[PDB]
């Protein structure tokens, strides 16, 4: 019932920790985490568009959705990433073409603009890179060569903003 971002979650880590791997138990936890984040933002952006008497979800509704979900300085960076990405593409490790397709199925009565998945791909790529950086740090501190769910929940634990995001 969930999408598969394991390819792009892995492509992000080789940019964050090139000589580090990830367990498959830790891979599905990241994949489900990215899924819980996508749907929450897509649900808010849809309500925001229906709230403001609109019907095409744009990068504007994606940002305000992100600002209304990610706490503190997580929303500060994710907004910087989404805005920077949208202007550059009217690179990114997430499939903008696939994320656009997923956004449309949320409700076919609401159109989806081209700039919305560009913003969402950057935010998802940022939230992935931040978790794998802290989880990758906890693994190299233990001299281990790949990330386990132990280092995942450890990364979320000592990060209050990440822990508030669940």
Q: Beta partners for 97?
A: none
Which experimental approach was used here? X-ray
Q: How many CB atoms lie within 10 A of CB 162?
A: 19
| C-alpha atoms less than 13 angstroms from C-alpha of 90 in its C-beta half-sphere | 1
Contact 117, 103 (CB under 8 A): yes
Q: Which two tokens stand for residue 79?
A: 């907004």
Q: What is the distance between the alpha carbons of residues 7 and 34, in angstroms, rounded to a whole number?
A: 12
User: Which is it for strands 56-57 and 111-112: parallel, antiparallel or unpaired?
Assistant: parallel
φ/ψ region of 104 (left if φ > 0, alpha if ψ in -120 to 50, else beta) reads alpha
Contact 158, 130 (CB under 8 A): no
Q: What is the CATH number of the domain that holds 53?
A: 1.10.20.10
- Structural domains of the chain, count: 1
Residue 142's domain spans which residues? 1-166
Resolution to 1 decimal place, in Å? 2.9
Q: What is the distance between the alpha carbons of residues 166 and 162, in angstroms, rounded to a whole number?
A: 7
Q: How many CB atoms lie within 10 A of CB 53?
A: 6
Residue ranges in 68-114 assigned as alpha helix (H)? 73-88, 96-106
């Amino acid at each position: 019932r969930k999408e598969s971002y394991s390819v792009y979650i892995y492509r992000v880590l080789k940019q964050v920790h090139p000589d580090t791997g990830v367990s498959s138990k830790a891979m599905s936890i990241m994949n489900s985490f990215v899924n819980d984040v996508f749907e929450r933002i897509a649900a808010e952006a849809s309500r925001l568009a229906h709230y403001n008497k609109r019907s095409t979800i744009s990068s504007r509704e994606i940002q305000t959705a992100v600002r209304l979900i990610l706490p503190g300085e997580l929303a500060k960076h994710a907004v910087s990433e989404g805005t920077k990405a949208v202007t550059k593409y009217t690179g990114l490790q997430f499939p903008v073409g696939r994320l656009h397709r997923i956004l449309r199925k949320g409700n076919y009565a609401q159109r989806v603009g081209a700039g919305a998945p560009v913003y969402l791909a950057a935010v998802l790529e940022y939230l992935a890179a931040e978790v794998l950086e802290l989880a990758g740090n906890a693994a190299r501190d233990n001299k281990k060569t790949r990330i386990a769910p132990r280092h995942l929940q450890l990364a979320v634990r000592n990060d209050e903003e990440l822990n508030k995001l669940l």
